[PDB]
Amino acid sequence: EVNSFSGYLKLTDNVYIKNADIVEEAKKVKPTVVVNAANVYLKHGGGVAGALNKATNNAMQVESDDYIATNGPLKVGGSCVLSGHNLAKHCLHVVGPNVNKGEDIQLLKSAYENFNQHEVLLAPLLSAGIFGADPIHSLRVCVDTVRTNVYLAVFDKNLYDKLVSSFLE
Numbered sequence: 830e831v832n833s834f835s836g837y838l839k840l841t842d843n844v845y846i847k848n849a850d851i852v853e854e855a856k857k858v859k860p861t862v863v864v865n866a867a868n869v870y871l872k873h874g875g876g877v878a879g880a881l882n883k884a885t886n887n888a889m890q891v892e893s894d895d896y897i898a899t900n901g902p903l904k905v906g907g908s909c910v911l912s913g914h915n916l917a918k919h920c921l922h923v924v925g926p927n928v929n930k931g932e933d934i935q936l937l938k939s940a941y942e943n944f945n946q947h948e949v950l951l952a953p954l955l956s957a958g959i960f961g962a963d964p965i966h967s968l969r970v971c972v973d974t975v976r977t978n979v980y981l982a983v984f985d986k987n988l989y990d991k992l993v994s995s996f997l998e
């Protein structure tokens with residue numbers, strides 16, 4: 830079955846959310862697109878990006894280095910489409926702003942706008958965790974910006990509950 834997402838809560842007509850590890854979701858669902866929470870040089874050193882790269886047994890990092898050699902780094906708010914490897918048909922590498930490193934939070938809208946080139950995506954909550962954005966604000970920008978069908982995997986039950994309660998106010 831194609832894009833067999835299970836156990837998500839529908840927030841709006843095109844945004845769904847689950848308390849889940851994006852890596853485990855990608856292995857089970859094998860979505861058409863999985864979103865990576867990338868940086869501009871596609872160095873998948875830890876967090877979500879490191880976990881997705883490790884699940885490809887480093888094939889994602891080798892492919893990423895070859896893309897950067899030929900094309901140069903991405904811009905903050907930008908993206909590129911590369912292979913999904915064993916996780917998906919394609920991986921959409923999206924660079925959200927890292928507010929802990931001084932990048933502008935307004936670029937989070939540009940980051941989510943990349944999702945609209947793909948009909949169905951499995952994605953993390955951009956710029957959350959160690960990128961420093963307020964995760965409730967990231968969900969609001971997602972809901973207001975994405976018009977295609979997005980399935981958000983948030984690997985923390987405490988944050989999942991706060992996000993759903995924030996949305997349903």
Ligand SMILES: CC(C)[C@H](Nc1ncnc2[nH]c(-c3cnc(N4CC(O)C4)nc3)cc12)c1ccc2c(c1)S(=O)(=O)CCC2
Binds near residue numbers: 851876878955956
């Ligand atoms: C908010 C937080 C709960 C969320 N975390 C996540 N959300 C969804 N799926 C996830 N899988 C993992 C994971 C991590 N490590 C291992 N590992 C196997 C072993 O080698 C370590 N496996 C899976 C974490 C994760 C989140 C969302 C966005 C961002 C971050 C974190 S970040 O990575 O801090 C910076 C980039 C933006």
